[model samples]
Target: RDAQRMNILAGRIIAETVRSTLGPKGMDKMLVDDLGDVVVTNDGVTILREMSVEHPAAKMLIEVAKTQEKEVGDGTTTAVVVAGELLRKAEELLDQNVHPTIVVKGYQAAAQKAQELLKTIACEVGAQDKEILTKIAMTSITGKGAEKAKEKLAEIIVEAVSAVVDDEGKVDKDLIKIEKKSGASIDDTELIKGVLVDKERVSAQMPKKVTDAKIALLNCAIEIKETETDAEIRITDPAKLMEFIEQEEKMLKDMVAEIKASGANVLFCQKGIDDLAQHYLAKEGIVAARRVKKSDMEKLAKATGANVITNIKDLSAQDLGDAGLVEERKISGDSMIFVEECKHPKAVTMLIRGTTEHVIEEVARAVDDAVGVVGCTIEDGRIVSGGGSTEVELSMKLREYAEGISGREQLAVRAFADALEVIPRTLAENAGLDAIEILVKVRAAHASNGNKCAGLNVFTGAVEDMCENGVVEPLRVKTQAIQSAAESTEMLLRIDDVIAAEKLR
Candidate 1:
């Protein structure tokens, strides 16, 4: 009994921390660390991770959110809140002396029922439907940091995803790169047909622009040779030193000659380019950049259809890549090379810009959620109506399922059903609507039409069909949230004893 009381206290506290951040009109939390760094967000996982939680029960709730996030990129708040609500219901039953094992068994049965109901109510969508895909992306990106520019971001997200998807319908997320810079308004964000290298031209003498570029991706350096071990060269004569310097200069020049001979007009080297090599390459009208990252090099290979050659001698005409244009442009007062206009690039990049660091951070998070949701939907090929409609449907059906159970377990099933309603109720409360009023109306609406998609509309303060309102989410998010919440709540509720070690004196 002492263990149950402490668990309930800790669980309720953790749930309350994320309760207000539940819906579209949910409030944001400003978490300030001991060092005075502030993080403003409504993301449940982010908030829980930032908090200094120590209770064992509370940590279990956090694990629920983490699992939900790992399985599905969104709906973390719903998972945690549902777990808390389940525990709340279980506490009420424990007060009546109901056994914990019975509650766990009943919850397991109800959770299975809830998943079946979700599948029955889910609407099918083809991955090729641009309109539906964009709307789904919009749903995931809305009600967060990028709310003001959700429409624009949604279109860009769809384009980026569509471009990275292959003919076999396999989408490589790594192929879709995100480049963020702070300086401009959020509206300035755009998608590139090819990869964007963060490094600038290797030499000022090189041309800042090149059209119809034949790019060479090199893993070798353009600098003069160096011994592997430390060694000293004796300057026996000044004339011999001059001859040695000339020999080094000639070697650098030959590297450029080999690059130019490969029919490459743009050069991206993974290692350093000596000053003499840069001068020679610039004189030959070859645009160059040095010390490109390995990841970006892979992206460039995919974008430009070029092979990354490590040896200078292996560079040839067939190794060059095709690009419509490669140019160095100054963005946000910094020079960045834009590798755009590829002929059907297999990889792409999205350049995100915002006025402030906070706005950019929030927008980046929003975009990540959008990208993840879109990818999930395309992979699953099914979606369910959002706006708490799915949860309400599950709750209504679970209650009917509760009546079939015989024994004390029926009470636990009913408790599970009641816990499911916490989603729509909290959404209503956060939207400033009367929770009881909206809850009753939505229940009536679902009953009258027999449509599982009926949910509370916070904007109009009416219970309506969420599907018609363009509010939908990936089915995985809903299904995972239910499973994670049920399992964690059961684990916490079944604990009947607590044992702590004595502190050192």
Candidate 2:
């Protein structure tokens, strides 16, 4: 049916779109229109999501990349590229009259087997393997903007990921906050052992530094009207008006009293502070920042061990969190507050430095991927050889697996095995190497020596040891990519027809 062709055709084009952006030598994509806004990035999901992908099946391929992005952070390109290649190989098999469902079964078998074998091939890393953790981060960030000083970023990522992980060995990527600022050397990027708030003091008169600070994290505003006087008539006498003015000041000061009574010298409010309340906080020598983001407030709590109090009346000494120093610092023409040197902070911040807006955005994206993989590695405690060695090894093993099966589905399994080669080929092609020759030579190396480490060394245009070269990745990236690619590709493989209704509604 023409159904498979349109779907396959659409999938192939989308896959090819991101294939070029796959590795260390991969190219970045620049997308612009008549509109003044434009975009540029080397990230797979970033590119696919930004591009005007309207094809029915292409969106499914895009979904594949997105799944990889959420599940494994660093393999969107791999998953997208593998899906494209699978579509390509399946086309050749259908030409030989291979049924779609049979191919589906075969691809699934291949995917499950590859993941299972991926574990066997992967080397386990202990929690103490900080050296390898940096390698995994380095590998994840190698092709993106942070490659400028990936080594520094990797160390920063590993250290931050380490800090974010708490008792019973838990690590959540969001626990580590990332803030980017330009006009700094790329190598200047550093991790804070505590939280960084982009907000500054609410009033200029407030202290810029609070040493050994007790921090109050508030989810409520610092201003309000509590008592209802219900006096119907307006006060006409100056005496009554002056008394009202005096009483208003007392209530405002009483609000500050509530804060001071908690022994908190540093206040981070998740809601706004009234002008008078700001002055009261300043008069009381309390450094306060109003309307701090909820996430930042959470980070502050995790870092400082404070409870975010929703009720001012309920706030007490026990709710305060400790920070060795809370200070205001100006950087790159902006004000930022630091809540650092907390005791055993379970959350942290990473400030990425770069030279321009575009550069910093790209670097921030890279840092995100680095953080994701490092956390994944720390949590999973396993990694695989990269530079296509892992893919090459999986293909060889899957071939052996396919040979033992006695069904027409075996041909589709062989195709899945062939499709896995896209990673190595795309790697070499992006490096401007002889992709076909490199593939054959790498295959020859795999066959000749039986070493799973055999992979393309693009710098030398030869197939050699990827494991020894330090080109490795978190095993999750490879396994996740294969599974996503197979699942998405199989879903598209058996489509009966194309239904074009982009704007039918």
Candidate 3:
């Protein structure tokens, strides 16, 4: 009895520890790990993962959030915070001597009610307002970026996010990239269509830009090494390594020639695009970028209309093109390129930028979470609309329904909701938003409707009375977040004390 009380108290303290940081008014946590590595972010999942969560109950809460994350890819923060809130409620019941089982049941019932409440709060998410996109962007970025950075980034965030949320779109992790520059503030934000790798030319004679480029995304790298040599085969290790080196060189040259014959003007390699391949491709007038994420490779394919070639020698005549290259668009040095028409870029590179390191990282985290949720939503429910606006609405609605639940169940539900809000709220916070007010707006909207297009006033109900019956359809996820939460909660509650009582006499 004493241990349970102590544990409950510990859980309560842990909950309150992050409570004030909840919503817009939430504080940014500065975390320094044991290895002396430093990270700062407002994202819940990152915070939870990095934080030294020691308490058993608190650890359980973290686990609930983790499960939600695994299922949806977003909503960790919402799930954790809301679960904390529900635990707080449960603590109150425990103080009143209410049976844990009864309390747990009541919380679940309350969650069911919350989902219905979400229906009322949601708006039908079509292309009702571009401002809605801006709102979401602003929400995701509000507290992180600089004063002007929010507005600037909002447009970029909206565009990138929207593109990824398209009909066949899923939250691809590489669609967004975070660059930590040597000298830049949170104000210097920008966006791009293709992915970037930190690479310098192996051939000085090569053209930097291909005017009419036929691009290719390769799963394997274009390195000249017969084996995996980290520092570009310049090693002095000349024992029996010399014989292995010769054979490796033959294979590498053959591979390069095959890629060259494929007629690719631009090449992106997810694995190892070697110095030898770079040198050969550069000599052949091919602009090659290597060490890209599989996600970015897909985006490159989509944006440029390029094909992701598995084999270097299989490029058909139709695969070659000169219209896919986009010239010096955004970013510095006018060196970075955006491919508008490629053989394939089904996966996009979402380069998330910010003036401040923390802000950009947070925005990146939020984008990742939101994308994961959308991906899950697409996997479970199926996606509609061009761009991702429709998917965002659906995600938002699902999150609200999740918020309706309580106890451990509420954790998953809130996670879904939070994941959806990450984009808009982060954007808003980045834009110097009134955090508290915006959070209230989010909560109110979730309470009343799911993914409705009621503008920002959906929660405030500034509309005329006759339209109250407006029903925004939630995205049809395979299994509702509510059900998942309920199941997880039930499983958790059934296991009270796992400790073995008997001692070895």
- When 1 and 3 are scored with lDDT, the better candidate is 1
Residue 307 miss distance in model 2 (angstroms): 4.2
lDDT of 2 by residue, 1-505 (tens): 5555554566656666677776656676566767857666566677655568556566656655665566665666766666666677666777887666676777778778776787788887777667676666665565554446666766766666665566667677666667767756776566666666677665788787778888777776766554456645477776786787677688887667887777877776666666666666666777776666666667667666678877777777877988877788866646777778755666666787677888888777766666666667677777777776777776777777888998556777787777676676676776776776546666676675577777777666776687655677777777666667767766776676667557785
Q: What residue pairs are clashing in model 2?
A: none
**What pairs collide in candidate 1?**
none
Candidate-wise lDDT, in order: 0.73, 0.69, 0.49
Residues 1-505 of candidate 1 have per-residue lDDT tens digits of 4666766767777677778876666677676877988767656667766678767667756666666667766677777777777776666777887777776788788877777777777778775678888777766665664556778877778777776667777676777667778766876677767767667765687777778888777775767666679988778666796788688876776666887777887777667667666567667877766666777777667666678887777777777878887777866646677778756766666788888777787777766666777887777787888887777666666777778887656777777777777777787787777887556777776775676777777777787777676687778887777777768776676777886779857
Error of 1 at 361 (Å): 5.1
Q: Model 2, residue 466: displacement in angstroms?
A: 2.5
Taking all chains together, each candidate's TM-score versus the true structure is 0.84, 0.76, 0.52
Best by lDDT: 1
**Model 3, position 387: C-alpha lDDT score:** 13
Minimum summed lDDT over a 10-residue window in model 1 is located at 139-148
Model 2 earns a TM-score of: 0.76
How far residue 325's Cα lies from its native spot in candidate 1, in Å, is 4.2
Residue lDDT tens for model 3, 1-505: 5555555445545544554454445676565767987765555566666677665455665666666566555434543333444444455435555555754565465456555554533344433245544544454444444464556765765566566565654455554555544224545455544445555444556665566766666666555433355555454755767686577677777777776676666655556554444455555665655556566555444554556666666667565434445443335432345554433444445554445565555566655544443334333343222111232445545554555654554543343334334334433444455545655554443354443343332223332121232212224321244445554445444556745567957
By lDDT, is 2 or 3 better? 2
How accurate locally is residue 138 in candidate 2, as Cα lDDT from 0 to 100?
Answer: 64
